[model samples]
Target: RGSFVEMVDNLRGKSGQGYYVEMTVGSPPQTLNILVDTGSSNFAVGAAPHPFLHRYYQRQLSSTYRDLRKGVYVPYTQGKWEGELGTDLVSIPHGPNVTVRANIAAITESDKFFINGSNWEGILGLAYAEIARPDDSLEPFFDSLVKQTHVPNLFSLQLCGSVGGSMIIGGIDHSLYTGSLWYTPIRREWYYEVIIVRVEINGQDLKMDCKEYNYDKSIVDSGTTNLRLPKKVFEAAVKSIKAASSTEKFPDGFWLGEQLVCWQAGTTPWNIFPVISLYLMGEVTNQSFRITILPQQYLRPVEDVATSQDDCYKFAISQSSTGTVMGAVIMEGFYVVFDRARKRIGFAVSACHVHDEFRTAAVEGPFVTLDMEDCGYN
Candidate 1:
C-alpha cells in the first residue's frame, strides 16, 4: 500500500524529444533535473556550468556531500557518461518527501568536466545495480528505497504521446489504466529483461521460427524512442509489414538510419493497417502476457512530432543488436508497472490516447487478459 506519485515531465529535447524528472539532492538540496532511465543503474548529475537557470552539481555547495574518490564510465547503447563517485542526501517526490540518506551518485561537473545538457542535467539510472560498470557499485535509488522499505519496491510508468502521464514510485495507481495489468517475468535482473515467445502481425506470425522467438531477449526500455529489433528480425518485420500496406517503400538509404518508413501513410495508421500483438513468456509467474501496439502507435504520421513528415509515415526502426529492444514506442500507449518485489513487470491500457486517436483499437478497446495471478501479480 505504500506509494507516491511523481508527475513525469514530458520535456522534448532538441533534435529533439525526451522525458525527465525533477528531484533534489544534497543537505540543503539543489534541484537536479534529469532524464529518468530504467535501462541502467548509477546516477550522475552533469555539470551544466553554463549561464542558465539550471545549476549543475558542484560538490562544494553541499554540506552533506562526500567524495568517494571512485568513478565509473556509464555505457549506453549509443553513448556514455564518465564521472567520479560521491554520496549525498537525495530527496525524491515520493508520497511524503522521500529522502534517502547516503545516496551514491556521480558529480560530473568540475574544472575539467562539463555537460552539454539537453533533455537532462544528468541521468538517473533505474536498472539493476550489479551491471553498472567500473566496479564501484552504488545501490540504485529505487533499490535504495526498496532496501530501506521506504517504497513498496514497485514503480509504474504511464506515458502517452508527449504528455499527461505520470511516474508512480512505490505503488500502483489503478486510475491511470483500464481493465487488468498483464505481468511478465524478469528473465534477468540486470535489465528489466523478458523473453518473447511470439510476435504476430495482423494476427499472423511475424515469420519468425520458434528458436527466433524463444531466444529473443527483449527489454522494455524507457530510454529508447522506438522499438529496436535485431537485424534479421527487423528485416523480417519490415518485409511482413510492408506486404500488408499499399504505400510505397521509402527510397533505399534515404530513410537514413531508419529501417522501415511508410512516408506516404495518412494521419491514421490503424485504419490503414492491422494490429501487432506481442506474446511474451512470464517465467517468474508461470504465466504469459499479450501486449497490443496498433498500427498507429507503430506508424506515426507527418503531423505527429515523432514522424519524419518530410516523406510520409516513418514506421518504427529496427536495431542491429544482440536481442530486441521494446522501448518507449510500444510503451507510450500503455500504463507500465515494474514490480521489484515480485521481479515482474505489468502492462495495462492507458486511458490517455496519443494523437487524439480515439478510434484506434488500443484506445477504443483495452487489452485486458488474465487476473492478477495469471500475470503472477499476486
Candidate 2:
C-alpha cells in the first residue's frame, strides 16, 4: 500500500500543552517519543543520554549508516535537536508501519531546558521544505514519506482535547468531520500561513486600525499553545472582552499581561466571555471564510498565577507578534486537513467517521492497503 495512517500520541503532557509520537530509529529499532511539531522541518532524535531515552540511536549499531559530516541548526522553541547530518532507517509501527531511509538531523547540542524534564526524545517536523533550516536539502519527514510511499498528498489532524486522538496520513476520512471543509489556499509553504479577514466579536467588530505596520499573514499552528494577538489588535480585543464581561476597570496588580490574562479564579463568569470570529481571505480565489473562535475554545482554564492552588485562570494571551495567530486553543474541536497536493488547508467541525479503512488504522496504528489514487501534488 502506498498510503498509510499512523497514530500520534496526544499524551496529556504533565502541563497538557504538548503532543508526541512514537518513532523507531536505526536498524535495531530504538524507541523515541518525539514531539509532533508542524512548525518545523527537521527529523531528529536525542544524541544525549536521558531517562526516557535509554536505547539511543548509535550509528555503529545500524549497518546502513553514513555521515554527511555537515552541521545544520534548527532553532525555535519545542524543538530539541541539532547536530551533524547522517542517514539511517526511521521506522514507525502500525498505520502502514511505514519506514524510510532518510537523512537524520542528529543532535549535537540540544536545549537543556527540556532535556532533563521532557518526556519525548526528539522531534518530527511536519512542514514544507522551504522552512527546513540550515539547508533545505534535507526533506521534511512527511515529504519523504509521500515521495517514498506515493500516496495522496493529504494528511489530517483531529485533536481530541488534551489527550491522545489521531493523525491521518495519505487521504482524508470523510466520516471524521461535519459540514463542509472550507479550503483556504496557503501563501507560503514556509509556515501554515493563511489569510485572516477580520476579527468579529458577537455582531460587533473588534476595533483594529493597522495601516502602518508591516505584518505577515496569520498562521494556523498546532504547536503554538496559546493565542497571541498582534499589539494594536490585542488592545482592542482586551477592551472588548472586558466590556462584554461587564466588568469594571481592573484594579492595580490584576496580572494584565500580553501573553496571559489573569483574574480571580473559582468565580465562573459565564456571560463574561465572547465568541471571537477569525475571518480570512483565499490566495487565488479571494474567497472569504470565518473560523470562529468560540468562548469555549479560547477560554483556557489553568492554575492561578498566585500561590493559590485552587483558583483557575482563563489564559488568552494579549501581546504582539508579526501577524495574528490561531493556535491550538482556537483549533481544539476542528478537523484540519493539509492538502499538500494543492497547497490548500481545510477546517471542519470534527466528528466520528466510521467504516473507512483509513479511520480504523489511525486509531489502531496498523497497516492496510488503501484503494485511493495517488492524486499527484502540484
Clashing pairs in 1: 13-16, 13-17, 263-312, 263-313
lDDT of 1: 0.63
Best by lDDT: 1
Expressed as tens digits, the lDDT of each residue in 1-378 for candidate 2 is: 222334433233433446666677787777777676666677877776655454456677777777888887766544544677887877766334578887787776765524455567677778877878676778888888878876567777766553554566676766556677776777679877665555677658754432211144466776666677767666677677767776544432332543434445545454466666665554333345666555555556664357554445455554556666666666665778887888888877766311222111111111121211111111
CA RMSD of all predictions: 5.3, 8.7
Total backbone collisions, model 1: 4
Global lDDT scores for all candidate models: 0.63, 0.61
Which parts of model 1 have CA positions greater than 4 angstroms off? 2-16, 48-53, 75-77, 94-96, 102-104, 107-119, 162-164, 214-216, 247-249, 254-270, 283-287, 300-313, 355-378
| Clashing pairs for predicted structure model 2, backbone only | 82-108, 94-365, 95-365, 95-366, 175-353, 197-279, 197-280, 258-318, 259-317
RMSD of 1: 5.3
**9 Cα displacement, candidate 1 (Å):** 6.9
- Model 2, residue 61: distance off in Å is 2.4
